[PDB]
Amino acid sequence: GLRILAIDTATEACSVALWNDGTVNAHFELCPREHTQRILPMVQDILTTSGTSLTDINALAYGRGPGSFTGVRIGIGIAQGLALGAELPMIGVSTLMTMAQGAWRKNGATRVLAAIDARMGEVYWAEYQRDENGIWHGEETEAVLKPEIVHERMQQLSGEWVTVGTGWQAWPDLGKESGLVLRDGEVLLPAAEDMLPIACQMFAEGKTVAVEHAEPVYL
Amino acid sequence: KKAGLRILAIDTATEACSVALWNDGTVNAHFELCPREHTQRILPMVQDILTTSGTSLTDINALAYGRGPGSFTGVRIGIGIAQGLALGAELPMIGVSTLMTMAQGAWRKNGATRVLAAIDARMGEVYWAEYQRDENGIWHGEETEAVLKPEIVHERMQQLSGEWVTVGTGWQAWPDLGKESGLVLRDGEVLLPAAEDMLPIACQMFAEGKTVAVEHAEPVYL
Ligand SMILES: [Gd+3]
Ligand SMILES: [Gd+3]
Ligand SMILES: [Gd+3]
Ligand SMILES: [Gd+3]
Ligand SMILES: [Gd+3]
Ligand SMILES: [Gd+3]
């Protein structure tokens, strides 16, 4: 069948998740001071408990960010090491889309507004809406900008959206006067488990990369 | 097929990104620069070297990695990649000092036996080390590794004696660090660590059983 191993260290969360035909085996935690110090243990626990072998995985999915500059790269490096080891293609998954896919998993959100607390007053933003087939649209809306522009962009949308990401909690004032119906997507950080559905789909479409060109996204 | 010590080393602790394999008496290495942590080039370098030597990751005896000190991000990316490469093949890992690595490079290039290693740690400091190669080719001075201010480096050099060679970006970040040290200093011809130089150190550590499991690969904390 089809097997995909997902890894994410892009934000304050570090997570691993194995998709095995339909069986999802995942772990999720907040990364300690030594950011990725738990990733390998998580990978070892998941592979052993699922009785799966790296030799039998079909592709490595990795969190491409945006998020922490340091965090993201370490996770990617780990994924590359594993992927070169098993001669496997890699799949870069947006942390914003991942959180969007997260909202739809907990409740049923279809129109997500991803906001991650970035650098300065800046913020990683994205407008994601999944179609009927369950595919997320709006990857082009991804960008890094100030809460003022966030306020502007928002007043050019419609209907009701659910919110995800640290951005909203950092500025609960971000929604104020957004001129839109807003709820709580119940997703603060992205999880590898949610990379799986996206990865699966990208693997089916050929949206993969050679280990040598796996890298963070540049907003 | 033909058995023999096989050790794969990679490093991204500094701006440099290098890889090297010790395969049956010979050294096969690549050295490049990876500015702004764009370390993806480590993977093709590893692949090419493996392919050229007819070596498989499963044939490796140990994977040597950069333990630092160096860039906060760089050292961790390197460890991450090394960990990824070691899991499937269950490769033992060997942490090699970035500072010691440069000392080894100085010996390689000019037979230096007493090395003053200094890395621009940024934010006003430097990673320091005093390494002396004994007759058996063993590097002493690891216990001297520390993070300190230039003025403190100056004070410490005055407590030193003899002739030394300098290596690392530390010296260029602080040009007067050598002046009035009371020591006779020559350039060691090493600005940044190179995987090639991790190999000798790694062979010796593997011989002494100084290794760790994948999940225990860690950066040094100074
Ligand atoms: Gd502590
Ligand atoms: Gd560029
Ligand atoms: Gd900077
Ligand atoms: Gd600090
Ligand atoms: Gd000679
Ligand atoms: Gd000079």
Curated annotation (Swiss-Prot), chain B:
Its main location: cytoplasm. It is found in: Cytoplasm. Gene3D superfamilies: 3.30.420.40. Disruption phenotype: Appears essential for growth, since no null mutants can be obtained. Conditional depletion of this gene leads to enlarged cells, which display highly condensed nucleoids. The TsaB depletion phenotype is suppressed by overexpressing the response regulator RstA. The keyword Transferase does not apply. InterPro entries: ATPase_NBD (IPR043129), Gcp-like_dom (IPR000905), T6A_TsaB (IPR022496). Keywords: Cytoplasm, tRNA processing. GO terms for cellular component: cytosol; EKC/KEOPS complex. It holds the Pfam family TsaD. GO terms for molecular function: identical protein binding; metallopeptidase activity. It comes from the Bacteria. The keyword Repeat does not apply. GO terms for biological process: maintenance of translational fidelity; tRNA threonylcarbamoyladenosine modification. TsaBCDE are necessary and sufficient for tRNA(NNU) t(6)A37 threonylcarbamoyladenosine modification in vitro in E.coli. Required for the formation of a threonylcarbamoyl group on adenosine at position 37 (t(6)A37) in tRNAs that read codons beginning with adenine. Is probably involved in the transfer of the threonylcarbamoyl moiety of threonylcarbamoyl-AMP (TC-AMP) to the N6 group of A37, together with TsaD and TsaE. TsaB seems to play an indirect role in the t(6)A biosynthesis pathway, possibly in regulating the core enzymatic function of TsaD. Belongs to the KAE1 / TsaD family. TsaB subfamily. Homodimer. Interacts with TsaD and TsaE in a mutually exclusive manner; TsaD is the preferred partner. Also interacts with TsaC. PANTHER family: TRNA N6-ADENOSINE THREONYLCARBAMOYLTRANSFERASE, TRNA THREONYLCARBAMOYLADENOSINE BIOSYNTHESIS PROTEIN TSAB. This is tRNA threonylcarbamoyladenosine biosynthesis protein TsaB.
